[PDB]
Symmetry: none
Subunit: 108 residues, 2 copies
Amino acid sequence: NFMLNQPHSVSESPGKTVTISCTRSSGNIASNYVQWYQQSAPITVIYEDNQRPSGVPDRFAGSIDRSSNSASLTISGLKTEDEADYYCQSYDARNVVFGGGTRLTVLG
Amino acid sequence: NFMLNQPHSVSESPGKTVTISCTRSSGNIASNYVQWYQQSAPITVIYEDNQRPSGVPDRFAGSIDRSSNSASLTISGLKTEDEADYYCQSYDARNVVFGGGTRLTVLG
């Protein structure tokens, strides 16, 4: 299978843009859909690489970078409310794979 | 105890073979298992000299050279995602030791 690796921490000031990356260790990041959860239980903020569920602010964006074999969650216009852990997730034909999660600290 | 020594930096173009070596300063390199970590927290890419954990691509290979009292991590067919800090690690009857690390840059 594979693992997904993310930094544990990222920080930024309100109004600014932050990116959390999720590197896949083996295989192609493009081969399976990537979901992002914010953490109660984790809630979905991105699914199928870049789709936002109902209610999730447009400031949350998912992307895939095949060249670095990674997925990224980019949060623009950072709000205090966005402080949370964010986990990426994908699949290896059945079994769920989870990143280690990244804490977004919002400065101020 | 001992110290482990690796060159600061290795440069190589994509698709080629890079070797990063780790020399033990005292005692037998064979006497204790060598682990390699890729760096978020270190994650194991080689353990017990030459074992790849699940998720680690076959292009990564660990080896021991008793004739140079060294351990080596060899990466065939380089990829840009492989850009990281690489550290070796072994034991000295209890306590543990890390190499200074090696930056693999992928050129072009």
